[PDB]
Every structure is written in structure tokens, then in C-alpha cells.
């Protein structure tokens with residue numbers, strides 16, 4: 001079980017936001033905490049990606065680009081998994097010290113996005129997604145958004161993405177002998193994977209908008225987050241970089 005051994009081994013451990021839960025649930029306090037958590041996670045996201053099987057095969061430039069493009073989707077998906085495994089998707093578990101209940105969802109000003117993320121988290125339960133499927137799908141999300149015009153080394157990327165799909169295929173078939181059973185599961189998993197993209201798109205828009213009006217005085221947005229939102233996110237929003245949907249949207 002080489003492939004799965006690796007996925008489990010490189011999976012980041014718990015990361016706290018450093019949020020003081022005694023403070024009032026203001027937009028400012030929740031924003032400060034979310035961003036701090038964001039910057040902290042990004043640190044782990046980069047090391048995670050670079051330790052992924054075959055990732056080093058990508059051109060240096062494509063490595064960081066791909067990481068930065070899928071960043072948001074990766075955080076949505078993983079966050080959704082933590083909510084499911086920790087609080088049975090009852091609340092949004094961004095971190096042990098930063099759990100969103102109804103009031104915080106409203107206070108953050110991303111209530112609808114949170115509700116959509118809550119749905120996503122519940123799909124992990126309805127579909128009975130295994131830790132194995134979760135890990136392989138999360139890795140695939142890393143390879144699910146690229147420039148329309150292509151990456152420095154597009155063929156290496158396509159090769160890699162294909163191999164990860166093949167792995168997701170092995171997972172599904174490991175305990176399934178009748179093809180139909182397998183096809184049904186693949187359908188379910190690819191539909192779930194797709195559903196992450198629309199949510200990340202809205203979060204991308206929300207982040208961009210906030211960065212702009214925030215720049216006015218408080219450019220308090222962390223460094224790495226600030227770089228991705230000002231340099232990479234617009235490429236997505238303007239349509240130069242797009243997600244790779246499995247099914248027609």
C-alpha cells in the first residue's frame with residue numbers, strides 16, 4: 001500500500017488559528033483569525049504538495065503556480081473533512097480553536113458560502129467517504145485548476161493528474177468486482193470534486209473584494225495570502241486560469 005502510506009504520512013497535522021475564543025465575535029476578530037490560520041496553513045500546504053508522489057516532476061514555476069491556484073479549493077475540501085470527522089458537520093471546523101457556529105457564519109459575512117461548505121461537509125457522511133478516498137481526492141484537487149493557455153510543462157502535469165485519477169480508480173476497485181459498482185462510485189466522487197470549485201470561486205471573489213477595500217489603510221492581509229490574492233486569484237476571476245471540471249457545468 002505504497003501510495004496510501006505516503007498520502008497518510010505527508011498529511012499535515014492539526015493547525016490552530018491562535019484565536020482567543022473569549023473575544024467578541026466581530027468581523028474584525030474573525031477576519032484576523034481566519035487570515036492568520038490561512039497564512040499558517042499555506043506554510044504546510046506548500047510542503048505537503050512538494051512531498052506528493054511525482055510532484056517534483058513538474059517545472060519549478062508550475063509547482064508554485066498550481067499550488068497557489070488550488071489553494072482555496074484545497075482548504076475548503078480539507079476544512080469540510082475536519083468538520084465531518086470532528087463535529088459531524090454540525091459546525092464549520094476551521095481549526096480546534098476556530099469553530100464556526102450559526103452566529104459566526106453571519107458575523108464573517110460569508111454566511112451563504114459557509115452554508116454551501118456545510119453541505120459539502122455533509123456529503124462526506126452521506127457518501128460515506130473513506131480516509132483513503134478523501135486523501136486521494138484532496139491530492140487530485142491540487143491538479144484541478146490550470147491556465148487555459150497551459151503550464152510551462154503541461155505534458156508532465158497531464159501525466160501526473162492522470163496517474164492520480166488512476167490511483168483513485170484503484171481505491172474504488174480494490175473491493176469492488178462488478179464494473180457498474182465502480183462506475184457509480186467514480187461518478188459520485190467526481191461530482192463531489194467538481195462541487196468544490198464553485199464554492200472556491202465565490203471564496204476567491206470574496207477574498208479579492210476584501211483585499212481591495214482592505215488595502216485602504218489596513219493591508220493587514222498576511223504576505224503569502226496577499227500575494228496569491230493580488231497575483232494569482234485575478235487570473236482565475238478574469239478567466240485566464242480555470243478549474244478542470246469532470247462533468248459539464
Ligand SMILES: CC(=O)O[C@]1(C(C)=O)CC[C@H]2[C@@H]3C=C(Cl)C4=CC(=O)[C@@H]5C[C@@H]5[C@]4(C)[C@H]3CC[C@@]21C
Pocket residue numbers: 031034035037038041072075076079094108109110203204206207208210211
Ligand atoms: C471572512 C473572509 O473573507 O475570509 C476570507 C478573507 C478574504 O478574509 C475569504 C475566504 C477565506 C478563506 C476560506 C477558507 Cl475555506 C479558509 C479555510 C481554512 O481552513 C483557513 C481559514 C483559512 C481560509 C483559507 C479562509 C481565510 C480567510 C478568507 C481568505
